[PDB]
């Protein structure tokens, strides 16, 4: 299931650290992350294994990192446990395509 309205309720788990619309808080601003370069917001300083990772945030790279972030990038400052169900990750990735 890839629904952007159910992805807005799943993004309430992200809202306290991350704000979509230009504003960088505890994490960076997430407007248009689907396809965006790893360590790409010039303005937010990232972790050293996040800067050394490379490539882009594709829908499989976002599904692996949102399943467990500190197992995928060993030494990221993202203090989030994980989304185990596919519908929560796929609904959220449809909302992050909706806000490009
Ligand atoms: C605060 C406790 C966070 C929560 C809750 C979530 N994330 Fe976060 N995110 C946070 C930080 C501090 C960072 C930077 C990590 C680093 O190593 O520098 C991040 C990063 C992401 C990223 C990468 C973005 C990029 O521009 O490279 C993504 C894709 C990301 N976080 C997504 C995300 C989502 C969708 C969350 C809710 C399910 C989520 N984060 C929660 C801090 C926190």
UniProtKB/Swiss-Prot annotation:
Binding site for heme c: 14, 17-18, 50, 78
Keyword tRNA processing tagged: no
Superkingdom, natural source: Bacteria
Localization per record: Cell membrane
Post-translational modification: Binds 1 heme c group covalently per subunit.
GO molecular function: electron transfer activity; heme binding; metal ion binding
Function: Mediates the electron transport between the cytochrome bc1 complex and cytochrome-c oxidase.
Record protein name field: Cytochrome c-552
Organism name: Paracoccus denitrificans
Range covered out of full length: 78 to 176 of 176
